[PDB]
Amino acid sequence: SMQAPHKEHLYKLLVIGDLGVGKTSIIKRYVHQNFSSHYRATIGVDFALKVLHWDPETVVRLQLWDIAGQERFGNMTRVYYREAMGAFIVFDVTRPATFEAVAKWKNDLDSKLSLPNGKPVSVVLLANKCDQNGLKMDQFCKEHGFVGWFETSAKENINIDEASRCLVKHILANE
């Protein structure tokens, strides 16, 4: 048979952002290679598993937590975030009110979760629905403690493989 991988990683990753920004769609594209325009609102939280053959020696398993957009108005997001090693925070480029919610989610996450060493977790910002300022997005990341941002489309499959690759790169880098 095949030589077993040298190393296998399992990481919990959060997907957060306000109602309808595309959290579920990004996960469905990334994991199941599919999209539909039909809005099925998440109730509480749903889960998916991405297997990355990271290198010939290395598997990375990503336990994706698809959190519903109104969960930040509840009382225990602290439980949702427990043991996560990274997050995507998503907004809808067509609805600027969802961009305002990004800092709300980021502040909620950073207040309730740190790595064992007390460091904040790696977070990438996804500017989603780009199928429907570069410097300013960079400045925003530096001001709010994001490692990166990408324009994404679950519909056209833009930059979702790249954003996830770059987030896992950062999570390994703190190891």
Ligand X SMILES: Nc1nc2c(ncn2[C@@H]2O[C@H](COP(=O)(O)OP(=O)(O)OP(=O)(O)O)[C@@H](O)[C@H]2O)c(=O)[nH]1
Regarding 127 and contact with ligand X (CB under 6 A), the answer is no
Q: Which is nearer to Br ion, 34 or 70 (CB)?
A: 70
Regarding 126 and contact with ligand X (CB under 6 A), the answer is no
Of positions 1, 3, 37, 133, contacts ligand X by CB under 6 A = 37
* Rounded alpha-carbon distances, angstroms, from residue 1 to 49, 57, 68: 25, 15, 42
Regarding 129 and contact with ligand X (CB under 6 A), the answer is yes
Of positions 77, 122, 128, 164, contacts ligand X by CB under 6 A = 128
H/E stretch holding 105 reads helix 96-112
Regarding 72 and contact with ligand X (CB under 6 A), the answer is no
159 binds, among Br ion, Mg ion, ligand X, none (CB under 5 to 8 A by kind): none
H/E stretch holding 89 reads strand 84-92
Q: Binding site annotation covers 37?
A: yes
d(CA 127, CA 65): 19
Eight-class DSSP state of 168: H
Sheet (strand 84-92) strand order: 45-55, 58-67, 7-16, 84-92, 122-128, 148-152
- Residue ranges for the known binding site for GTP are 20-25, 36-37, 39, 42, 69, 129, 131, 154-155
- Chain positions contacting Br ion, by CB under 5 A: 19, 38, 70, 97
